[PDB]
Every structure is written in structure tokens, then in C-alpha cells.
Design a protein around this ligand. Structure first.
Ligand SMILES: CCCCCCCCCCCCCCCCCC(=O)OC[C@H](COP(=O)(O)OCCN)OC(=O)CCCCCCCCCCCCCCCCC
Ligand SMILES: CCCCCCCCCCCCCCCCCC(=O)OC[C@H](COP(=O)(O)OCCN)OC(=O)CCCCCCCCCCCCCCCCC
Ligand code: SF4
Ligand code: SF4
Ligand code: SF4
Lengths: 317, 176, 53, 161, 152, 49, 112
């Protein structure tokens, strides 16, 4: 019954991305002083099952001046890596016990930009031709802001597995000994996964969001779908790394209860940022990576190399 | 006179630079700024629940048209041709005839509801106080062939209520 | 507002902004980005139908 | 969006040709409206500007408040936005019993609503970064072009009519 | 049968559960639509989310005033919309053109370009007679695609 | 301790207005669920509260 | 032997749902005006894709900063070790060797 476990994880998470689109706007609504979806629910709660069927009735045109084998291959690789990344992730037991899987996250988070380079090219012209080229350019630069300060906690964890990442935090809630790194951990995933203040991928008044701009609601229904699957997955990855919960072997039930409550709270922030702050005007977006984000990340890197040595506090492995 | 805004140099000493270098680096703004001003969600939302609740209006409101008539009926119009001469948009189209009894009346009366720019110039040009902008925005028909009004629509539309209209004009004729 | 002397007027030429405020964008825009240009236009408070001057 | 600011410059351009002044109460009505449309043309220029940039809420935060003020046109003229009210001989008709216990309740509580945009925008850093030293036309080519006010006096020359 | 005509109690309910309007804000009836997205008579979350892109929208809402120099740019945008598309014209200038019905530079009616479903009259309709306009559009959806393939 | 300080008012408000059937019957049209204070008289059965 | 049947489920469920949206409910033989339209919300773009210098240097610069984090990658494995004065003083070298490559290029970036 291994095969019944995989389907027990793909299916209960497509609701949690469909019942986030509803909480996308109720939370964003009471900031504006207005109620949620009022009339169809009764409370709203039945909105996404009606708002899903309309997309698969509405005619999925392909553009006449488009290519063929590239345009319908990027949504295959969209939902592939958006759902494959949920595998090696402990809660409290992961589906797969990888020896080194923290690196496997970057082995999965690297190839997502290789679909945007397809879809911006595969269909058509300037509102997604050059307008998606400068969306690959922001997402590549926020790995070296990411991969360094992901390594900067592993000097204190001890190894590459994720079971040690819960063992080392039984008494600490490790956001305290590394709170400068925890800041730039947030803004990276806030800009890499293409969200509200550092936007130009989706597109406000930029490429009039020319990375979708062309998908009718047949193939478009996943892009949004798949994408919303990253944003609840960097939140499930931050809360297993910094704000780690407590594991008890005799009681694994109380792990998940105290766990899903925490990833939901960080997921609120991606909604709660959007209702405050304006955009970044593509220069100043990348003007603060090199000049401003990056030299501090090397500074704490050299700090976290020497401090396990000159404390005589080497983590065991 | 004057007022100068954004005309002030920084202090530029040893003390207040740490006050500004705590801002850029550790964000004493941008959380005290807008992590608190936004939430502040704890007010009661103000949404008119539209199919049941409706919003406030005023007894001089402009809307659907009507033609009143006297106590026991006389079709208060007398076809004096003023409500058609000060429509700015030339909607009204009157063609009178001497009716058989001797008093003159209309035969055809036509108000487009698309050229109607909703002045209130028909409402106030009338001497015999007949054509009244009535207070009901109920509209939204599905054909352009329909919004052209005849005479015998307006009377029906003007006798679906007069308890509505005559409560309004009695309140408001004292100013004009 | 040229008035001839009877009930219907002669020419009525309107002066409104948008002739001054938007002929002087081509000077104002050169050197900056493209995403600076949408930042420029909002401060003139351009309302159309008033460029019907 | 200017409703009573236009027709203020048509009625005044026909009274000159007639040799007629408006009567004294007809002048303190026109100012109470001609300086209340300057709280409508400036709500829009500071919100829709900051919606093109991308801030969501101060649009919604001000228009929820703005609907207390399209109420005031309906109670006096009859209608919602475009009111044919000002005439070339002063105001059409008198304003009802009221509007002085309702402008006063309104206008004693507007300085807090404008105390929100100061904390949304002014000492904000990202919006200051989106707008400093951008579009600096300041010369006497910024008067050779024949500009009227702001994009004048906001840059130098103090003058208004 | 009872099997097939029951299925259009879902598809003709799914099609009226979330409309996605494009709007053409051109003239004064743009602003009196924006007050409906303002949270008093709040347009969104009574079923119908606001403005989107031209590739994804169901039901467009013409407003303002269509001149000659906007007449081809309307019809081009109407083509890209999908098959279950609907057209609502608000405003008294997309009904026969307000005034400016007699001046040279106005397309006299906006039905002469596209087929339009629900006409809403009034210089600016008060965002109160526009929710009543769209609640007439949802009542229009009583059609069925069953008993078409099942009759003929 | 506001979890029971103000729910006590809402307990009679939610439950004891029309029992089990009279509550969810108005819930399925909108979230207009508050029982009003006064009543209207007119006209048919539609008591405009 | 499930790793490898832990993903071929996930991709055959992925390619299932795309062909029951792109194919099946689709086939637009009716009117389906695919004329000259569908041009990405525009018209005819007679120009090709022009070169942009400031968007090439962003590609190369990343690539040379990407290499020596893989040298920097086995630092946690370089902890449980022998002689560690060597291990500390060599680990500090590469970061400075990455840092100087900033400061030379930092005197000329351009509008990136
Ligand atoms: C459009 C449809 C057509 C395309 C359909 C196919 C698409 C497939 C794309 C999937 C790409 C995922 C590739 C990821 C490779 C990384 C796998 C991995 O590293 O697993 C971790 C583990 C490492 O070993 P270890 O951790 O030490 O095990 C514990 C021992 N105590 O390793 C293991 O546990 C076992 C290692 C051997 C398992 C078999 C080999 C894994 C790769 C098989 C697929 C080959 C890749 C196909 C090409 C990829 C294209 C993107
Ligand atoms: C000797 C003992 C050892 C000493 C150890 C001392 C530890 C010190 C730790 C300091 C390092 C951590 C702080 C990180 C640096 C902050 C990032 C930064 O430098 O931003 C600079 C940015 C540039 O703009 P600026 O310089 O201000 O110029 C414009 C002024 N007109 O200006 C900015 O402020 C930009 C602000 C961020 C931009 C994104 C904002 C979008 C919203 C993000 C909200 C995030 C909220 C928190 C994240 C979640 C936290 C859990
Ligand atoms: S209402 Fe007055 S103006 Fe109009 S037709 Fe009758 S008498 Fe003439
Ligand atoms: S409201 Fe004005 S334009 Fe319309 S019919 Fe009456 S007078 Fe004519
Ligand atoms: S006539 Fe009506 S639709 Fe046209 S600009 Fe005036 S208010 Fe707007």
C-alpha cells in the first residue's frame, strides 16, 4: 500500500491550493473593509468548486502564430516539479528518507525557470518575448542570495539530512542565533517565487504580466494552480528549518497539529505584504541584490565558519 | 503667502545618524509603518447587501419618467411645447391635434431613454406641473427597440405609482 | 467666448490643461527608464475629454 | 471629476458679458462647493497614481470614505455626479434644511483620514525610492511651455490666480 | 431526459458563478463603475471578481463613448474573447450616444459594432442600477445546451 | 476570556431564532443571518425588518 | 524500488490533465476564426529580437559566482576532520577570492 500513500498526498493538497484562492481574497478583503464572497457559499466555502468547472468548459484556443511542441510541454514541467518537490519533506515522517535532500530542494527549485524561458519563447512576440527574458534574469540572481545563506545554517546543523534539522532544534527555535540570515531568507523566497512587491513575472503594470498573457483557461488553469503550489511549499520549508517544532515518537499525532498551524501563519504574510507595498521598478529590484543584499551574506558566511571553531562547539556527524 | 515643504537638511551629527542607521538596516520603519496601519482590519465592514438592503437617496433624485394626472383623471399634460424646446439633447417628440371635446391634448409623445441626458430641464420648464422625473432607477431592458418610450407607456409607468411621486413633490416644491 | 449678440453664441474655445501638461512630457522623459514613464504621467493628473481643448 | 469647478468658469464668463454680479449668498455657496471639489480631484490624483505604481489599499481606503461626499451632491442638486446646478445668475435653488450638521460632522473628521496617507506614503521608503528626482523639468523651459499650476509652484515659481 | 437536462443545472450554474469583466473605461461612466469596486456597493465577492486580461474574460462591459478612432480597436478586442462571451453596455452613450448623437465623430450606438445583451440607461447609472443590470444578466442564464443535442 | 463573555449573547442569537430549521433557511441565500430588532407590517408575508 | 514510481505517477497524472484540456474538450472546427489574430494582443512585429548588452552580462556574472559555491559546498563535511588550522584558513580564502571579484566588477556594473 505504498501506491495508496502517494495518491493520499497529491489529492488532499489540490484542495489546499483551491481553498487558498478563496482565503486569498477574504483576508485581502477585510483589509479594505469589505466582506468575503457573500452569496454563493453560503460563507464563500463552495466558491472554488464552481470557479473550477468554468475554466474547463471555456474554449482553449491555441495562438495561430505559435509553435507546437514547446507550448504544450511547459505546463507538463510546471505541475511536475511543483508536485515532485513535496516528496522528501518530513511531517514528522517523510515519504522518502533521502540521505541528502536539502540539496535536492535546490535540485528542484532550479529547473522551474526553464519553463518560463520556454513559454515566453514558445508562443509569441514582445509582450512575452523580451518581457519574459527579464523574468528569467531576476530568478537566476536570487539563488546566490539563497544558496549561501541556506548553507550558512548547515554549518550549525551538522549534515545534509532533514531528520537532524529537527533534532538540533529541540530547545532553541533557531531563528534566534541567526536572525540576520532569517531576514534575507524571507525576501529571497518573496522574490524568487514571483510575488507581489518584486513583481514583473505575474505582472502589474509591467509586461502586463506577459508570462500568462496568452494562455486561455484550458492550459492557464494549471499555471495558476501549479504556481500556488510553490508558495505553500517554501512556507512548509521555512518552518522545518528555522521555526522547528518538537517531535515525540510515542505521540506523532500532536506533531502535525502544532505544525500545520505554523506554515499557515507564514503563508498569511504573502497575502499580508501585497496589501501594503508598491513595486520595485526593475533596476532597483536587482540594484539591491548585488550592491546591498550580497556582501552581508558573505560576511555572515565567514562569521558562521569561525564561530563553531572558536567556541569548540562542532556539530556532530 | 508661502509654505515650504521638504526644505530641511539632515542634522548630520554623531547621535542622529544612528537614529537613521537603525532605520535602513534594522527596519524601524516599514513594520511600525505598515505592519500595524493595515491591521487595523478589526473594524466592521460597510457593505450594502444589495438584493435586500438598499442605499440612501434624496427626495430630489432623477430617474425614470412619468406623466401625472389630476384628481379624477385629466391627463395633466396640455401640449404647450416647452418640455421639448429645452431638452438639450432633443429627445422629446410631441405632435398635438385638437381633440374632439375642444381641449387640446397630445397624440404622440416620445422620449428616448438613450438620448435622455438626465437634466431636469423638462421637470422645471412645465407650467402645468405634469412631466416629472420619477424616483426609480429600475431599468436594464435587453433590446434597443424597447427603450424608446411612447405616450401610453409613460402613463402606465406614471400610474404604477403616484403615492411615491406626490410624497416627493409636496416636500420639495417650497424651494422652487 | 465670442458672443455675436443673439441667443445662440459664436465660437467657444476652451483652454484646459493636457496641452501644456503633456506636450512637456517629451522633454521630461528622455534619459530615464520605461518604468519611469508610467511614474511620470500620474503627477500631471491627466483626465481625458479635457484634452478636447 | 470636477463638477462644480467647471460651470464656475462658464457662469463667471457670462456674467462678465452681461454686467451682472451674483448676489451675496450666491458667492458663499460657490466657495463651499468650489473648495469641496478640491477634496475630490486630489483624492483621485494621489490614489490612481498609487495604483498604477501598485499599492492596493489607499485606493480602497479613500473611496470607501469618498462615498460620504457624493451623498452631498444628491441632497442639494438632485443627482449623483453631473449636477446642472450653477447657472449664469448664481445657484439654481436653495439647499435643504440640514447640510450644516452634516458637513460639520464630516469635515471635523477628515484630518485623520489624511493622516493615514502620511503614514502610507511619505516616510515610506519604497515609494520614496519610486519617486525622487524623477522627471525634473524645472527651467524656464518649464514656463516657456506655458504650464499652469502644480508642475509649476511645486517647482519654484510661487504664483496662483 | 432527466439525466441530460440535469447536467445543465451545473454548467449553466458554473457559467454564472464567476464572471470576469473586461471594462472599457473611456469617459465619465468609468468613475461611477469604480465606486462599485469601492467597498460600499462592493462588486467583487458578490460572485464577480473585477478587471482582468483580454484572453481570460467572459463578459465585457462597454462604457464611455465610442468615436471613430476606437471603433476598430473595439472589434479586434471582441474577437479574442472566448465562445461563451457576453456584452453589456452601460452608460447612455453606448445606447445611441447620449448627446454627441448628432456630431460627426461618434459611432452612433455601439450596437452597430457588436451584439450587446443588456442595455443599462442613465448618464452615469448610479452603480445601484448596475448591480440590478448584472442581476438581470444572471437571470438571462436559464438557457440549456441539453435539449439541443438531445432533441435534434 | 472573551470566548464566553460575548458568545453568551450570540448563543441565544444564533440558536434560539427559529430552532434548527429557521436558522439555515436564511443562511442559504446570503450571509444575512442577523435577526433584526423591530418588524414592518406590510404587506404579504414579507416583514421588512 | 519506489523512486522511480514515486515520480512516474506524478508525471503521468500531470500529462493526463493537460490532454483533457488541450485535447478532448477543445477541437475547434466550427467558426474558430484563426485568421491573422492571436498575435499576442498586438499587430505585426517586423523587427526581430534585438541584442541588449546590459542583459547579457547578467548571465555570465552569475555563472562565475555559481561555480565556487560548489567549492564552498563541502564545508559542513569539512568539520569532523584532522588538522583544522588548514581547514579554517583555506575556507576563508575562497570567500575573499569571491569577494575581490565583486569589487573589481563593482567599479563598473551598468544599468543592470
Ligand atoms: C513528459 C513526460 C516524459 C518524461 C517523464 C520522465 C520525467 C522524469 C523527471 C524526474 C527528474 C527527477 C530526477 C531527480 C534525480 C535525483 C534523485 C535522487 O537523488 O534521489 C536521492 C537518492 C540519493 O541516494 P541516497 O539519498 O543516498 O539514498 C539513501 C540510501 N541510504 O537517490 C535514490 O534514492 C535512488 C537513486 C536511484 C533511483 C533511480 C534513478 C533516479 C532517476 C530516474 C529517472 C532518470 C531521470 C530522467 C531524466 C530527468 C529529466 C528531467
Ligand atoms: C559585532 C557583533 C556582530 C554584529 C552583528 C550585527 C547584526 C546586524 C544585522 C544586519 C543585517 C540584516 C539586515 C539586512 C539588511 C537590510 C537589507 C538592505 O540593506 O536594504 C537596503 C535598502 C536600500 O535602500 P536604502 O539604502 O535605504 O536607500 C533608499 C533611501 N532613500 O533599503 C531598504 O530598507 C529596503 C527594505 C527591504 C526591501 C523589501 C521590502 C519589501 C517588504 C519586505 C518586508 C519583510 C518583513 C520581514 C520579513 C519577515 C521576517 C520574519
Ligand atoms: S408637460 Fe408641460 S411642457 Fe410637457 S407637453 Fe405637457 S404642458 Fe407641454
Ligand atoms: S431629462 Fe433633460 S434631456 Fe432628458 S428628456 Fe428631460 S429635459 Fe430632455
Ligand atoms: S454622457 Fe453619460 S456615459 Fe457619456 S461621458 Fe457623460 S456621463 Fe459618461
Amino acid at each position: 500500500m505504498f501506491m495508496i500513500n502517494i495518491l493520499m498526498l497529491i489529492i488532499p493538497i489540490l484542495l489546499a491550493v483551491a481553498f487558498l484562492t478563496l482565503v486569498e481574497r477574504k483576508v485581502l478583503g477585510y483589509m479594505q473593509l469589505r466582506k468575503g464572497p457573500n452569496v454563493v457559499g453560503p460563507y464563500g466555502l463552495l466558491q472554488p468548486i464552481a470557479d473550477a468547472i468554468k475554466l474547463f468548459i471555456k474554449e482553449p484556443l491555441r495562438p495561430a502564430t505559435s509553435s507546437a511542441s514547446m507550448f504544450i510541454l511547459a505546463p507538463i514541467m510546471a505541475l511536475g516539479l511543483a508536485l515532485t518537490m513535496w516528496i522528501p519533506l518530513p511531517m514528522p515522517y517523510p515519504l522518502i528518507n533521502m540521505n541528502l535532500g536539502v540539496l535536492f530542494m535546490l535540485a528542484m527549485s532550479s529547473l522551474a525557470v526553464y519553463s518560463i524561458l520556454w513559454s515566453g519563447w514558445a508562443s509569441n512576440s514582445k509582450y512575452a518575448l523580451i518581457g519574459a527574458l527579464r523574468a528569467v534574469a531576476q530568478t537566476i540572481s536570487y539563488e546566490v542570495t539563497l544558496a549561501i545563506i541556506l548553507l550558512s545554517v548547515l554549518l550549525m546543523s551538522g549534515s545534509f539530512t532533514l531528520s537532524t534539522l529537527i533534532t538540533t532544534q529541540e530547545q532553541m527555535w533557531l531563528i534566534l542565533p541567526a536572525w540576520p540570515l532569517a531576514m534575507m531568507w524571507f525576501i529571497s523566497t518573496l522574490a524568487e517565487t514571483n510575488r507581489a512587491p518584486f513583481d514583473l513575472t505575474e505582472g502589474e503594470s509591467e509586461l502586463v504580466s506577459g508570462f500568462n498573457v496568452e494562455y486561455a483557461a484550458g492550459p492557464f488553469a494549471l499555471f495558476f494552480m501549479a504556481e500556488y503550489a510553490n508558495i505553500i511549499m517554501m512556507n512548509i520549508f521555512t518552518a522545518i528549518l528555522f521555526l522547528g517544532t518538537s517531535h515525540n515518537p510515542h505521540m506523532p499525532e500532536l506533531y502535525t497539529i502544532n505544525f500545520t498551524i505554523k506554515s499557515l501563519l507564514l503563508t498569511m504574510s504573502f497575502l499580508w505584504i501585497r496589501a501594503s507595498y508598491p513595486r520595485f521598478r526593475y533596476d532597483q529590484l536587482m540594484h539591491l541584490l548585488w550592491k546591498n543584499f550580497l556582501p552581508l551574506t558573505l560576511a555572515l558566511c565567514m562569521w558562521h565558519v569561525s564561530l563553531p571553531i572558536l567556541t569548540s562547539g562542532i556539530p556532530p556527524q | 503667502t508661502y509654505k515650504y515643504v521638504n526644505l530641511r537638511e539632515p542634522s548630520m551629527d554623531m547621535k542622529s545618524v544612528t537614529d537613521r542607521a537603525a532605520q535602513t538596516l534594522l527596519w524601524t520603519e516599514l513594520i511600525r509603518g505598515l505592519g500595524m496601519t493595515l491591521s487595523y482590519l478589526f473594524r466592521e465592514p460597510a457593505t450594502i447587501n444589495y438584493p435586500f438592503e438598499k442605499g440612501p437617496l434624496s427626495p430630489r433624485f432623477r430617474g425614470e419618467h412619468a406623466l401625472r394626472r389630476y384628481p379624477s383623471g385629466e391627463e395633466r399634460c396640455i401640449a404647450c411645447k416647452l418640455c421639448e424646446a429645452v431638452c438639450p439633447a432633443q429627445a422629446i417628440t410631441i405632435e398635438a391635434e385638437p381633440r374632439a371635446d375642444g381641449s387640446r391634448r397630445t397624440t404622440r409623445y416620445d422620449i428616448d431613454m438613450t438620448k435622455c441626458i438626465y437634466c431636469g430641464f423638462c421637470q422645471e420648464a412645465c407650467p402645468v406641473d405634469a412631466i416629472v422625473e420619477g424616483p426609480n432607477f429600475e431599468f436594464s431592458t435587453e433590446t434597443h427597440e424597447e427603450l424608446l418610450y411612447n405616450k401610453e407607456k409613460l402613463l402606465n409607468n406614471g400610474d404604477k405609482w403616484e403615492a411615491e411621486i406626490a410624497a416627493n413633490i409636496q416636500a420639495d416644491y417650497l424651494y422652487r | 467666448l465670442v458672443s455675436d449678440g443673439s441667443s445662440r453664441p459664436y465660437r467657444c474655445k476652451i483652454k484646459a490643461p493636457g496641452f501644456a501638461h503633456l506636450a512637456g512630457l517629451d522633454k521630461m522623459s528622455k534619459g530615464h527608464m520605461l518604468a519611469d514613464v508610467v511614474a511620470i504621467i500620474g503627477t500631471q493628473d491627466i483626465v481625458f475629454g479635457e484634452v478636447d481643448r | 471629476v470636477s463638477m462644480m469647478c467647471n460651470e464656475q468658469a462658464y457662469s463667471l464668463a457670462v456674467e462678465k458679458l452681461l454686467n451682472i454680479q451674483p448676489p451675496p449668498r450666491a458667492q458663499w455657496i460657490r466657495v463651499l462647493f468650489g473648495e469641496i471639489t478640491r477634496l475630490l480631484n486630489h483624492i483621485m490624483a494621489v490614489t490612481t497614481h498609487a495604483l498604477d505604481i501598485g499599492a492596493m489599499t489607499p485606493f480602497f481606503w479613500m473611496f470607501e470614505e469618498r462615498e460620504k461626499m457624493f451623498e452631498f451632491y444628491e441632497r442639494v442638486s438632485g443627482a449623483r455626479m453631473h449636477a446642472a446646478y450653477v447657472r449664469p445668475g448664481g445657484v439654481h435653488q436653495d439647499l435643504p434644511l440640514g447640510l450644516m450638521d452634516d458637513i460639520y460632522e464630516f469635515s471635523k473628521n477628515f484630518s485623520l483620514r489624511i493622516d493615514e496617507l502620511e503614514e502610507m506614503l511619505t516616510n515610506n521608503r519604497i515609494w520614496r525610492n519610486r519617486t525622487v528626482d524623477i522627471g525634473i523639468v524645472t527651467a524656464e523651459d518649464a514656463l516657456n511651455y506655458g504650464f499652469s499650476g502644480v508642475m509649476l509652484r511645486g517647482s519654484g515659481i510661487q504664483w496662483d490666480l | 431526459e432527466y439525466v441530460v437536462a440535469k447536467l445543465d443545472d451545473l454548467i449553466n450554474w458554473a457559467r454564472r458563478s464567476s464572471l470576469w469583466p473586461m471594462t472599457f473605461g473611456l469617459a465619465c461612466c468609468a468613475v461611477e463603475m469604480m465606486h462599485m469596486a469601492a467597498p460600499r456597493y462592493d462588486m467583487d465577492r458578490f460572485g464577480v471578481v473585477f478587471r482582468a486580461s483580454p484572453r481570460q474574460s467572459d463578459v465585457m462591459i462597454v462604457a464611455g463613448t465610442l468615436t471613430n478612432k476606437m471603433a476598430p480597436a473595439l472589434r479586434k478586442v471582441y474577437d479574442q474573447m472566448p465562445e461563451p462571451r457576453y456584452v453589456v453596455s452601460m452608460g447612455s452613450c453606448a445606447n445611441g450616444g447620449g448627446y454627441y448623437h448628432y456630431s460627426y465623430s461618434v459611432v452612433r450606438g455601439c450596437d452597430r459594432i457588436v451584439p450587446v445583451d443588456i442595455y443599462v440607461p442613465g448618464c452615469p447609472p448610479t452603480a445601484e442600477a448596475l448591480l440590478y443590470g448584472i442581476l438581470q444578466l444572471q437571470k438571462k442564464i436559464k438557457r440549456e445546451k441539453r435539449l439541443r443535442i438531445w432533441y435534434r | 476570556m472573551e470566548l464566553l463573555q460575548v458568545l453568551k449573547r450570540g448563543l441565544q442569537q444564533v440558536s434560539g431564532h427559529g430552532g434548527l430549521r429557521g436558522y439555515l433557511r436564511v443562511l442559504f441565500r446570503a450571509n444575512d443571518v442577523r435577526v433584526g430588532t423591530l418588524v414592518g407590517e406590510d404587506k404579504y408575508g414579507n416583514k421588512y425588518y | 524500488m519506489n523512486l522511480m514510481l514515486a515520480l512516474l505517477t506524478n508525471f503521468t497524472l500531470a500529462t493526463l490533465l493537460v490532454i483533457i484540456a488541450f485535447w478532448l474538450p477543445q477541437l475547434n472546427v466550427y467558426s474558430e476564426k484563426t485568421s491573422p489574430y492571436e498575435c499576442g494582443f498586438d499587430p505585426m512585429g517586423s523587427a526581430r529580437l534585438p541584442f541588449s548588452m546590459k542583459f547579457f552580462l547578467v548571465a555570465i556574472t552569475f555563472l562565475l559566482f555559481d561555480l565556487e559555491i560548489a567549492l564552498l559546498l563541502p564545508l559542513p563535511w569539512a568539520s569532523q576532520t584532522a588538522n583544522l588550522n588548514t581547514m579554517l584558513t583555506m575556507a576563508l580564502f575562497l570567500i575573499i577570492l569571491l569577494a575581490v571579484s565583486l569589487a573589481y566588477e563593482w567599479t563598473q556594473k551598468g544599468l543592470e
